[PDB]
Design a binder for this molecule. Structure first.
Ligand SMILES: CCCCCCCCCCCC(=O)N[C@H]1CCOC1=O
Ligand SMILES: CCCCCCCCCCCC(=O)N[C@H]1CCOC1=O
Lengths: 454, 455
């Protein structure tokens, strides 16, 4: 039985001021490097234990001993995401109901149905970049957000955000991003009631109204038209939980649409932005990926089967998720009194945080070269030990969108690498913006067309 | 027989100048023409011009033995950034005939076949934009038509993509161009242009000119350095030799031609397409006849050059839209010698005339009492039209060089719109005409219902 280390304290505020930074996850990664596989993090009224080793995280991922916790971050996100899939407790009736109704919409098989709509948005991205003039550059995260938001809008709800027809952000996306940012900002407030935050709270309620108004209109419009689109909204309006036999109520459907739009856009746009970052910084890897895209994507429009043949592109995406998993932590609570790793006694209800980027740098799993971008680590996926690679979380509370995201990102990155050569014309210095999700900020490139027609 | 011509209301020392203190000066001059008739004197401090509205007088003004193109006060202000380009040059300037001879073959059928592919590129972007609207959404007609015609001339002019359909706010170059045009038209009403109140306007104007020159001169220098040959006007202008002088255009004149063409595409063809769609949704029998022609002729996903030339009724629709709202609403002439207009109005050498095209096109002695009705069938027998009765492209050797270009673009685009969509005047839109250099509907919105025909 060992005492776990704890980072520097600030008297009565304990560790809370360590979160007073626009990059809290990167701060916690540096703390993990200094303190090791486990450390105590205390704020007034809460304790959590940050885990960084596969040795301890494999135990935390035992669903008989630990269940998903709503971290302080998710409790704040629940103010707009309600009891949607992401911000519901496993024991809430609406978690299992929504999970059972929506799971078949998100299988590898279901991806065949979404494919044509993913291509629609991917072709818009390629056409945008083909139409740039000499000496113009690409704003990578901005264009990846346009792509991932439009893809989930169209595939999920048959709704066109038409993000590529706008050079200033969609009003809905302004509110979504600011709502997420307010959730992260609430984490570091020593005094949440300080009048300095009154404007932030008024803006938060305005942003919630913007999101609700659009979503509730989409639900009402679909109900009024009677249209069957075989999209997520169709499945949610018509679907019945096999267990309870109940449908979702209109309120829960609204929270699911908000949840899908936010998670769908934020995480996947981060992945594509990090993937392109690593490719232009590792030109040997860019060349391997570009050769595969050129050899496999022989048709103007990729087919579903051709996307499944982009093996190296898939390894590139997994290696980007290893280094910068875009939803970089998940929280667990102990179901009963238990001992973690034969050394750390826990009481029923005790919180754990899995620090995914640190897990993914565990030298006992990956070897000494853990900072290197080497997609070949994933060439034999079976070689990866249990619970060593967790970019989609764990068990029944794992990402429902995993197949969706990886199909979209593989298709899009394949088309990008088929159609363009890329130049890191600014020698971009990685700047990772945190809004609970991670994405490169200020990342620009030049694309030179290979002049291959669509 | 010699008559004194009427004159609208005066403002003491300012004479008629305050009549132009409006954002709708052409519409103001049309109402003056309705009241005073075929000719009126318009005086400002230090200038006089005579506004003509009847075919009887305009047919005389179009006599090239007696009258030549004049730079109206408007064109003199535009010449600060359009220089001695084709539009703002005098007929007798060496660079007018030289540029005219070099550029005429850039509007040959062979050149038009090359421009067609680039027009289709932009037209498909417009159709895709409208196909991608959600059910609750409307089209901003003049906004989308301007996006289309600017992008078309940018691609056809110098192989440059404004990417107007990727933007809510204009390209920085277009912000400067539009503000430069606005400054030119605003200078028309200024009693004292030297008032220090206008120092800011003048500073902004010089900044806007630098923005336009810097972009255009860079594109010309880049093209010369690369040696790349495209299907664009810039290639024709870098390679062309005037058969008369044997000289090519110099890089400065090429820049003025590019600015001239970009202003033309942004301003004129977008107006025509917006007015044409206005008249179609207000006249559903005409919309149906045009849509039946589009459906019969445009049988391929991408229209061909030859298919567009078969859209005869769509062409009549565009001519009838130009009759009622000619988007370039005036041209100016000066007397080459002392002469008498219409056997009644003595003119001295140098005297200025303004042709008020929208009034000409409402001459009931030519068109009949149904003159306000939208009837494309008026253009079934064009030989019936008296001399100089229909002048939307101006007159003689100074007539629009882009006439074929603009009518091909507008026919292609209107044809594709009518093939792909049904239109609804969902607001019962009341025509409101915004004036810049040109006339365009303002606030015109419609809903499109897709006929779901693939591209
Ligand atoms: C509507 C669904 C929400 C979609 C995005 C949610 C991503 C949540 C990841 C939360 C990770 C997380 O808890 N981060 C905390 C830990 C302390 O500092 C932080 O920032
Ligand atoms: C370089 C310009 C290219 C194409 C522009 C064509 C439009 C030119 C028309 C100029 C009309 C014009 O001179 N209008 C005056 C008449 C009195 O008040 C006005 O507004």
């Amino acid at each position: 039985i060992k005492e776990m280390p704890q980072p520097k304290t600030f008297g009565e505020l304990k560790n809370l001021p360590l979160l007073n930074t626009d990059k809290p996850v990167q701060a916690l990664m540096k703390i993990a490097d200094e303190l090791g596989e486990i450390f105590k993090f205390e704020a007034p009224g809460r304790v959590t234990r940050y885990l960084s080793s596969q040795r301890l995280i494999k135990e935390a991922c035992d669903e008989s001993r630990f269940d998903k916790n709503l971290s302080q971050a998710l409790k704040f996100v629940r103010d707009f995401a309600g009891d949607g899939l992401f911000t519901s407790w496993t024991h809430e009736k609406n978690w299992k109901k929504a999970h059972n109704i929506l799971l078949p919409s998100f299988s590898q098989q279901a991806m065949k149905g979404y494919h044509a709509m993913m291509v629609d948005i991917a072709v818009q991205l390629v056409q945008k970049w083909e139409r740039l003039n000499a000496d113009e550059h690409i704003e990578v995260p901005e264009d990846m957000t346009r792509l991932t938001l439009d893809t989930i809008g169209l595939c999920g709800f048959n709704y066109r955000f038409n993000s590529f027809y706008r050079d200033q952000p969609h009003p809905f996306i302004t509110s979504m991003v600011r709502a997420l940012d307010e959730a992260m900002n609430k984490l570091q407030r020593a005094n949440p009631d300080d009048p300095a935050y009154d404007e932030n709270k008024r803006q938060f309620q305005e942003d919630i109204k913007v999101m609700n108004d659009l979503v509730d209109k989409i639900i009402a419009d679909r109900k009024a038209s009677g249209e069957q689109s075989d999209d997520l909204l169709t499945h949610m309006l018509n679907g019945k939980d096999p267990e309870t036999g109940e449908p979702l109520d209109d309120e829960n459907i609204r929270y699911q649409i908000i949840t899908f739009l936010i998670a769908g856009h934020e995480t996947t746009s981060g992945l594509l932005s990090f993937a392109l970052y690593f490719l232009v910084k590792n030109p040997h890897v860019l060349q391997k990926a570009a050769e595969e895209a050129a050899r496999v994507l022989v048709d103007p429009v990729p087919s579903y089967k051709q996307v499944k043949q982009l093996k190296y592109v898939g390894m590139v995406l997994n290696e980007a998720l290893r280094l910068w998993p875009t939803a970089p932590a998940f929280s667990l609570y102990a179901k009963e009194d238990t001992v973690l790793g034969g050394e750390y006694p826990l009481e029923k209800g005790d919180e754990l945080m899995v620090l995914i980027p640190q897990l993914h740098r565990d030298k006992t799993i990956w070897g000494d070269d853990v900072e290197e971008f080497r997609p070949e680590r994933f060439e034999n996926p079976s070689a990866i030990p249990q619970h060593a690679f967790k970019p989609f979380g764990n068990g029944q509370r794992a990402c429902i969108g995993q197949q969706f995201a990886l199909h979209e990102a593989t298709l899009v990155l394949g088309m990008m690498l088929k159609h363009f050569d890329f130049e890191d014309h600014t020698n971009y210095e990685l700047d990772i913006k945190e809004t609970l999700t991670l994405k490169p900020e200020g990342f620009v490139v030049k694309a030179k067309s290979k002049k291959i027609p669509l």
